[PDB]
């Protein structure tokens, strides 16, 4: 059977606000598809805050967790407030323009508990800027201005410190979160599925196949006509969060007013023992 794999990922966003004060810095962390931590520099005396149930219990296993992480986030915010003007200098952009730095880093772990992939990537204004290579040894700057950052980061031995984190604390903390958040992260909640029926005219109806409250986010919805796939003819919305830690998705199909019985909806999701076939 399929071997599990899980991911711990952190997302940094820092953007300048000319005329409206200092740059802002927001960071979030995710274990697989569940957010568990946040930090906003705009807050009054900003602290790292829990955003998942099991993080409310992390203080008894590690009473220093929040102090440790608040310091690091406050340090990351200062680093990127400066980095905004450094990069702007590299491109000689005006000070009156707003610009964004983004960073995504984390680790994928295998079923055994060892590292599969480490990654660290940065964007500037929504385009690749610099990224750690798969060897976790060198960087890849995306344009001429980014080579400024790679030279500074090469001469400072940053990759070795990055790699040490990715193979080290990242793996260890993913495993700690997976155990403490076991009831949330290791669940496979199947979709609550049903078909709805909307007449548009005397000769045409809409058939909509719903999938509600499922976790993880990965899912497949297809419509079939006697056994024939219908992807081009159907409208498939992008999977969306429901606000309670789960996801929704639907696929709809316009169908002749006497032919509803000839179409089936098919739902595959990790929480389902068997793929579901529904019919109106």
């Amino acid at each position: 059977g399929s071997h599990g794999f899980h991911s711990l990922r952190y997302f940094y966003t820092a953007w300048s606000r000319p005329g409206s004060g200092e740059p802002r810095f927001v960071a979030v962390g995710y274990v697989d598809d569940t957010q568990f931590v946040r930090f906003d520099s705009d807050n009054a005396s900003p602290r790292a805050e829990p955003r998942a149930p099991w993080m409310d219990l992390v203080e008894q296993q590690d009473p220093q967790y929040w102090d440790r992480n608040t310091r690091n986030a406050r340090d990351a915010a200062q680093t990127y407030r400066v980095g905004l003007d450094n990069v702007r200098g590299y491109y000689n952009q005006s000070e009156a323009g707003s610009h964004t730095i983004q960073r995504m880093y984390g680790c994928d772990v295998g079923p055994h508990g060892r590292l599969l992939r480490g990654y660290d990537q940065l964007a500037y204004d929504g385009a690749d800027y610099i990224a750690l290579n798969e060897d976790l040894r060198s960087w890849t700057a995306a344009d001429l201005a980014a080579q400024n950052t790679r030279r500074k980061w090469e001469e400072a031995g940053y990759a070795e410190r990055d790699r040490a984190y990715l193979e080290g604390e990242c793996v260890e903390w993913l495993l700690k979160h997976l155990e403490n958040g076991r009831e949330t992260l290791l669940r496979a909640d199947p979709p609550k599925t049903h078909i709805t029926h909307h007449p548009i005219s005397d000769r045409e109806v809409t058939l909509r196949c719903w999938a509600l409250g499922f976790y993880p986010e990965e899912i497949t919805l297809t419509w079939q006509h006697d056994g024939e796939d219908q992807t081009q003819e159907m409208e498939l919305v992008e999977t969306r969060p429901d606000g309670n830690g789960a996801f929704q998705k639907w696929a709809a199909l316009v169908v002749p007013s006497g032919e509803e019985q000839r179409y089936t909806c098919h739902v595959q999701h990790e929480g389902l023992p068997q793929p579901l076939t529904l019919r109106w």
Binding site: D75, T79, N86, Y105, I130, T149, K152, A156, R161, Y165
Partner: peptide
């Protein structure tokens, strides 16, 4: 933990 490390671009 967040990355304790860091270096400005």
């Amino acid at each position: 933990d967040f990355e304790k490390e860091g270096y400005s671009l």
